[PDB]
Ligand binder design. Structure first.
Ligand SMILES: NC(=O)c1ccc[n+]([C@@H]2O[C@H](COP(=O)([O-])OP(=O)(O)OC[C@H]3O[C@@H](n4cnc5c(N)ncnc54)[C@H](O)[C@@H]3O)[C@@H](O)[C@H]2O)c1
Ligand SMILES: NC(=O)c1ccc[n+]([C@@H]2O[C@H](COP(=O)([O-])OP(=O)(O)OC[C@H]3O[C@@H](n4cnc5c(N)ncnc54)[C@H](O)[C@@H]3O)[C@@H](O)[C@H]2O)c1
Ligand SMILES: NC(=O)c1ccc[n+]([C@@H]2O[C@H](COP(=O)([O-])OP(=O)(O)OC[C@H]3O[C@@H](n4cnc5c(N)ncnc54)[C@H](O)[C@@H]3O)[C@@H](O)[C@H]2O)c1
Ligand SMILES: NC(=O)c1ccc[n+]([C@@H]2O[C@H](COP(=O)([O-])OP(=O)(O)OC[C@H]3O[C@@H](n4cnc5c(N)ncnc54)[C@H](O)[C@@H]3O)[C@@H](O)[C@H]2O)c1
Ligand SMILES: CC(=O)Nc1cccc(CO)c1
Ligand SMILES: Nc1ncnc2[nH]cnc12
Ligand SMILES: [K+]
Ligand SMILES: [K+]
Ligand SMILES: [K+]
Lengths: 461, 460, 464, 462
């Protein structure tokens, strides 16, 4: 009689379980931790509030935390990213999960609140796992008494880390955090290669458009922008890249992309006349990858080629000025998470109007909204890091420290390189790769231990 | 003017035409000329330089001189000099001691000619090095000269490693800048430079078709990354070996099969540990590690007949070429290309089919069999060098009190703003347009509109 | 729209509005096909044409169908594969009053019945006079079972490599009853659709079916013809380590030069019928096998026994017998993951352990995987193919082969391709659709290379 | 020993050439397989071959294969810049008449061809022709018709030469039958495409050492050479745009991921400067012509190109670029052999530091051979195995000995049978270590072929 959940359709659970069993075989680092630590139960007593895309991959993460002794209460960190068969499988396993694909904003907030509260009162949570910082922010704003008893936060993504560092700077961060994003087996695996796999995946599922031979503009060339640019270029798109960071721009040039700005001489002065109309009028697809605000603005949207596709693979939808489009233009749903936006006016549209843009996932994270996000074998790396980070902060027991010791430990840190390398080694073995062992003479010659770490902490890979 | 030694001074005109072309290819470096020419920040600098005497290094030398410095120059590899570049620098009245095809003895004599002027130590006060040979010679043989030197600017990964060993040991005598670790150096030069010049050098040396053939790249750091791409983009079936599992993960995700020369990755010294089936299929092996003996004697014995062997790390001991000198017969095809006959040591059959082709005698192949990295890539590295020389020369470490020196003795990188400024000029050289943040957008992501745009931890 | 319309069978008529929205988008992606619509609508060149059509009932086929109709034709339609229909496309066509018998997930019995519903109208043979076919199944049923209907049919326009091969065999054996146009071997079909179509849709289908990471894993592509070329690129551009098998040494040479290792499932390339001739070390490291040959049993039972545990098996050739799925049905237990995705447990026939590690993943039960697990080729690629189909239909219909005296009939009983000038005109509209700008020869340049300024620009022997 | 019947740059380079020939033999398994297969039979015994083709190391292996099969030859290069002097020396030192060096003048080029045609001042007793581009063929038809009476056939290497043969056939002026070697698939779709992929960026790097990644290229043409050339530059990271007059080839360029553009506004070349897309050409760092056509990089295009752009041609003849206009109007500064700065400031003198120049490679002649070494041995293996088979076939057919009525029936331009094309391909695949699968009899029956091939109808395009 388990009822402590809310999902779209519990009868999807058997299908979700079939897919979890497949995913397990694709996630050797994560399942390796499950097998290594199951006897020790290092998360016995852990009670984790989790807020991250309720995908099949997150399913394997949840069940690893539980297998290691944790209890959890779970929600998605995006209204469109849940895979309903994954949510159902977790619910059918007796795990509290409040998530479905296609939440409203009110429902999204209600789902987070159902993890925070059990039977109408604060759950006895003592750990947080977050992706983007929304759960973290709600706890700090609305539930400070709960944070007194929480040992730490493990944060998945660049945007969430930025929010933690802002709190730390302001003196408002209440518990320590591990930045999971900046393991190399996360940032330079998930953020880059994950988007390489899943960006063109989501565009094909949403539109079935041919991409080869067409013009793309990728805004940003960080890890997500690098992977996104490659996702499109490997399909044969002619890809131009915009950047504010000249070092990232240099990389894009050297990687074989033309670097362009939407604005004449790069000057974003807010006028229509600043838009490079010739450029925007040639673009068939624009993808935002920045984690910034309004990088595909109203004037770019007005100047885009007729029937261009617009999408965002950064964490939040405000990378695109969808507010402007809702205020001024008529939306025609093609199918879920695919809308034609008719620039002919607000009050209705002609079904055969040629002047429209196609928006994917209403501007929300397109890989998760229009496909299934990153593949299991990539999320393996991220989620092995999550499990290790949860173990580290739970074993440190920050909430039980005296005030003077808390002050010494209140920080945002990354996992040590030795763990990063060990996660990587399990990923490489999963491909059947064979890593060479240094001889003692070689290890002495380059000044490392035979078992690693093999690089100083400054190394950029 | 007689204070030089080059292969042929009459190549000077040719070198100068190529220097004028290279200037148009090096916007960050020529921008530093224009920006600092007025200030003359290196007025009074006396720089001992040791780096491959290419056309690219010619534009670097003439930038340092244009900013006020005097220099005395040598190459840091016996095969890397471009004789027309050396001639052009000598003809400009700049002391340089460098030619393509030096012996080891001549290489050392060349460095010594920069150190000594008219039989006595030059009154040098700055060092620019690539690999650390000159740094080592000064510390071991001319330690008193270091009392007048304000700093060392070191170009490459191997050289930086040697600097850090001296720092850890308390034997480093002057402060240094790690130029290698600017992003516009390491992630431009070390990677993209090798992408351009590895296939270049293999083609010049052998003219082999690469498409459809099997390569093994040992190492997947920045040089191994660029090297693997150099070969894969030509259509080679590239396999990658690594000891670092993170780099190996990147190789897998980049589309390469990760393998070891040794069964289960365990190199126990026996022939039985060699994966003979793997090595018997390899047409080309490239070492990229900066380590020792990563293409060892047993691997060389097991390689497919007529495979090519080369090294693009800093030093030739990546391949056990000593073994091949001791046991096999060398037939020169042309300079820096040898067939190594595995049939025996004394003599060979001119039609023997059992040989390997070694490029540049195991020395840096891109510089040895071609011209190293192209001007537009070296632009980034050498703009960093100029900035680093200006900074250390202006800090005047050798004039500090003995106690003040202790606080200054460090190995530093340039600040990120300068890295970004080098990058900006590179981007402009491609016609690229960098976008400017709005104030609200800069606030939103927590940076200044001016940058730097990333924390120092960011890995790009 | 027509009142009382019931002359169709589809999965779900309420998908029609969705299908119509996708057809309107597809129209914007198919400039060559929509150019023919605009150019010829007033002329009504297919007025009086009654076309039996048998091709994958996709959105792209929907635009083809409504172009034929816009040019005057009546049609009766079925899919040429049990898994290739897009149900929203079928619904939109039925809602337009067009007879269509097609849904995703037909049985083999339903598949044949759907073709017969196009052939029959109100229990009697329709008065068809044109055939449009993809793979030869409708052609075969007419010759085998309704030969008298062929007396009134002016021609067949055949879409794909396998169908043309069957047509040529019939022509050689004297059993083909009407002329045909080989649409496949227009360059704007074969070297666009067969190659780039599979480039787009093979990795698409694998991702939708399995969501497996492809980068870093090992693939074996059987065949390196046009489909094999595009399939190999589909996987290599994702970062797979792709090996290629071929029987044709010229195709194998191209694979080597394209950067692939060429290998055989059999030691020394020789299948001796025994497990010992399988290169078990090779197959034990393959994560994904894709058949592309148009041939039979190229991924056979012994290969399937040797494949790496949890390998994906799929076929993108026209017919499922490229893979010995019958052996797998007979000996191994099938577990459906979801529609068109099955785990095949090699532990035995009678039941399976839900956590068994020794299974293969079969996509689309071995049927064409791009259409079965995704949506096949994109509109902008199918534009080229289907423009050729319209032009082929117009040509054969205007030729009126069935009205000729018997002597003239023998003179015209042929399998032909469209002239190169038409192939070029299709290509030009495709190029303009990308915004590309073709240069016009000066008169002196055209004289210099011996062509007209308006083309054609190559001799018929040119291979591109 | 007493051999003087040659002219090369430097005979002392022979030992070097011989070392490179021995390496090239290991890279040319199809050609060396033909040597082993046919050495005993001597199918070319009595053949006397006039050869005109780039005197490279690869051509050296071809020549010694012909000679090992019984032929005598007299050889010249088909381009003034394409000879490798060590290859020419190794061949002369072997006692084979060769007249070829890198850097010939036009007068020297013609003299070299005449030295193969004439021996001791009189027509050689030639009975076979091997040609690359048709210059030797044209001279024989115009100046030595009596020699063609005794010649059994021409085997022609390249697209341009085949076009010239077809023009002769059309006009009824071709005097002996020919094999079009170009259009074996193991030539056209190996040499023309993959050879240029290998050797174009090679030649640009040797001539300029320019970084290509991140820069803008314009490739004129997208036939086999244009396809391989565009890949050569794209694989280096150039942003490549493609021009074409053939919309099918342009379609392939689009689908291959290139933007298709014209130097002329709306593609209309009306001879005015106003017709030039100056904004486009002002952004191009590198232009490469691949067409076999005339004046596809014309004077107004040259005037509009971005300052310091590289201009080169990889089609057979230099008239793809209007270099005549550049010689008449602009000042040429040699950087080094086959690399010239063309200063657009004027004809009489230049400023050594002028920024407004173009860099022309190989004076507009075939750039892969002019600035590097042309295609690699393992690719030329396919082209030259076809050459050897075509020589064997035409010499055994003995056209010159046929009666007039039988000549009229055999006077044609033909390709080699597909079975031979396949046999060349299989040796190439074995050279890579590739393992082709053998059809079972049932599978061969299913697709309608013999187990041993041919596997495709003659219409198949690959
Ligand atoms: N969808 C996914 O699966 C997924 C995966 C990982 C991360 N993310 C999200 O993607 C976003 C980016 O993450 P990342 O790791 O790439 O971060 P990053 O900091 O490495 O890269 C962002 C880049 O955008 C550039 N940029 C910022 N403002 C710009 C502007 N106005 N114009 C052009 N370029 C601009 C920055 O210079 C930077 O290089 C974050 O919100 C992150 O949380 C999404
Ligand atoms: N030739 C050039 O132009 C050029 C340019 C830059 C640097 N370099 C030199 O190249 C070398 C590599 O420099 P880098 O910047 O790539 O350094 P790096 O540290 O980034 O990479 C070296 C890599 O080698 C790997 N490695 C070490 N021992 C190994 C072994 N036994 N087997 C396999 N992999 C092994 C390490 O794990 C590491 O990833 C250095 O010597 C450097 O000075 C040469
Ligand atoms: N799924 C799609 O969207 C799609 C699209 C076009 C064509 N097709 C179908 O795909 C198939 C192939 O079409 P194509 O145009 O590439 O044909 P093709 O003749 O160009 O290629 C088939 C290739 O398979 C090779 N082959 C045959 N038997 C082999 C064997 N035992 N082992 C290895 N290689 C072998 C042949 O040598 C040939 O090169 C046909 O059935 C065709 O109808 C499917
Ligand atoms: N350098 C080499 O090693 C090498 C190798 C093979 C062939 N070739 C030569 O290269 C040339 C091309 O050979 P190919 O086999 O590619 O021929 P091709 O007929 O396959 O291709 C030439 C292409 O040029 C295009 N074209 C013609 N005029 C044009 C114009 N004004 N603008 C744009 N495109 C135009 C044609 O449409 C055609 O597609 C010939 O001269 C041939 O002999 C050179
Ligand atoms: C008839 C014939 O001789 N065919 C052939 C083609 C290429 C190579 C070889 C032997 O290598 C043979
Ligand atoms: N061309 C070049 N000049 C100087 N140092 C280099 N290191 C690598 N390539 C170089
Ligand atoms: K997924
Ligand atoms: K589709
Ligand atoms: K060559």
């Amino acid at each position: 009689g388990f009822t402590d959940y809310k999902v779209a359709d519990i009868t999807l659970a058997a299908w979700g379980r079939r897919e979890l069993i497949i995913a397990e075989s694709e996630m050797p680092a994560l399942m390796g931790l499950r097998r290594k630590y199951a006897g020790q139960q290092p998360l016995k007593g852990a009670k984790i509030l989790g807020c991250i895309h309720m995908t099949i991959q997150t399913g394997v993460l949840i069940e690893t935390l539980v297998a290691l002794g944790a209890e959890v209460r779970w929600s998605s960190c995006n209204i469109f990213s849940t895979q309903d068969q994954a949510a159902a499988a977790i619910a059918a396993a007796g795990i509290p999960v409040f998530a479905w694909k296609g939440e409203t904003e009110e429902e999204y907030e209600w789902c987070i609140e159902q993890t925070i509260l059990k039977d109408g009162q604060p759950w006895d949570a003592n750990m947080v796992l977050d992706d983007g910082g929304d759960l973290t922010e709600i706890l700090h704003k609305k539930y400070p008494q709960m944070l007194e008893r929480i040992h730490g936060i493990t944060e998945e993504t660049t945007t969430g880390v930025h929010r933690l560092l802002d709190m730390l700077k302001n003196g408002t961060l209440k518990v320590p955090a591990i930045n999971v994003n900046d393991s190399v087996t996360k940032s330079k695996n998930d953020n880059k290669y994950g988007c390489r796999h899943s960006l063109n995946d989501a565009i094909k599922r949403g539109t079935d458009h041919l991409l080869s031979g067409k013009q793309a503009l990728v805004i940003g060339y960080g890890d997500v922008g690098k992977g996104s640019s490659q996702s499109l270029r490997q399909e044969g798109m002619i890809v131009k890249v915009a950047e504010v960071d000249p070092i990232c721009a240099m990389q894009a040039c050297m990687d074989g992309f033309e670097v362009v700005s939407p604005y004449k001489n790069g000057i974003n002065d807010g006028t229509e006349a600043s838009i490079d109309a010739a450029l925007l009028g040639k673009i068939d697809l624009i993808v935002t990858t920045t984690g910034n605000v309004n990088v595909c603005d109203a004037n770019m949207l007005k100047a885009l080629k007729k029937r261009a596709v617009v999408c965002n693979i950064g964490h939040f939808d405000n990378e695109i000025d969808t507010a402007f489009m809702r205020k001024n233009w008529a939306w025609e749903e093609v199918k879920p998470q695919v809308h034609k936006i008719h620039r002919t006016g607000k009050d209705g549209f002609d079904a055969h109007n040629d002047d429209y843009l196609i928006l994917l996932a209403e501007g929300r994270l397109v890989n998760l909204g229009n496909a299934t996000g990153h593949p299991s074998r990539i999320m393996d790396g991220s989620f092995a890091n999550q499990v290790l980070a949860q173990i580290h902060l739970f074993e440190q027991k920050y909430a039980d420290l005296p005030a003077a010791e808390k002050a010494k430990r209140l920080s945002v840190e990354v996992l040590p390189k030795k763990l990063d390398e060990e996660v990587a080694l399990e990923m490489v073995k999963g491909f059947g790769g064979v890593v060479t062992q240094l001889t003692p003479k070689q290890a002495e010659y380059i000044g490392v231990s035979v078992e690693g770490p093999f690089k100083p902490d400054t190394y950029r890979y």
